[PDB]
């Protein structure tokens, strides 16, 4: 599990309201969050599927 998969989700300072996905390692699940459209961190994906493939590979 890459270390970045343990980051809390990071909205950033942007004013957009974009639906993105992060890997919630405690929950064992990819979950939606609101991304502001700028200053993304790595635990930020287009889909649940993308998040799982990077962070819950098995």
Residue numbers in the entry: 1001 to 1058
How did the manuscript describe this experimental structure?
Here, we report a structural and thermodynamic analysis of six extensively simplified BPTI variants, where 19–24 of its 58 residues are alanines, using differential scanning calorimetry (DSC) and X-ray crystallography. We used a stabilized BPTI- (BPTI- A14GA38V12), containing only the 5–55 disulfide bond, as the reference molecule instead of wild-type BPTI, which contains three disulfide bonds13, and a BPTI variant containing 19 alanines (BPTI-19A) as the template for further simplification. However, the alanine substitutions exerted a small unexpected enthalpy stabilization, and the magnitude of which increased in a nearly additive fashion along with the number of alanine substitutions, which was, however, over-compensated with entropy destabilization. A structural analysis indicated that new water molecules were recruited into the spaces created by the alanine substitutions, facilitating protein–water hydrogen-bonded interactions as well as interactions with the methyl group and creating hydration networks around the substitution sites.
We mutated the exposed and partially exposed residues (P8, K15, R17, R39, K41, R42, and D50) to alanines because we expected that these substitutions would minimally affect the densely packed interior of the native protein45. The mutants were named according to the numbers of alanines in their sequences (i.e. BPTI-19A stands for a BPTI variant containing 19 Alanines) and a suffix ‘a’ or ‘b’ was added to distinguish variants containing the same numbers of alanines at different sites45. To provide a structural view of this peculiar instance of enthalpy stabilization, we crystallized and solved the structures of six simplified BPTI variants containing 19, 20, 21, 22, 23, and 24 alanines. On the other hand, despite repeated trials, BPTI variants containing 25–27 alanines merely formed needle crystals, unsuitable for diffraction. All six variants crystallized under the same conditions, indicating a minimal disturbance of the surface properties, even upon multiple alanine substitutions. Seven novel water molecules appeared near residues 10–14 and the Gly14/Val38 pair, forming an elongated hydration network involving water molecules hydrogen-bonded to the backbone atoms of the protein. The R39A substitution also recruited 1–2 new water molecules close to the amide nitrogen of Ala39, extending the hydration networks observed in BPTI-21A. X-ray crystallographic analyses indicated that all of the simplified BPTI structures fully overlapped and that the main change that occurred upon the number of alanines was an increase in the solvent content in the asymmetric units. The new water molecules were recruited around the alanine substitution sites and were involved in novel hydration networks.
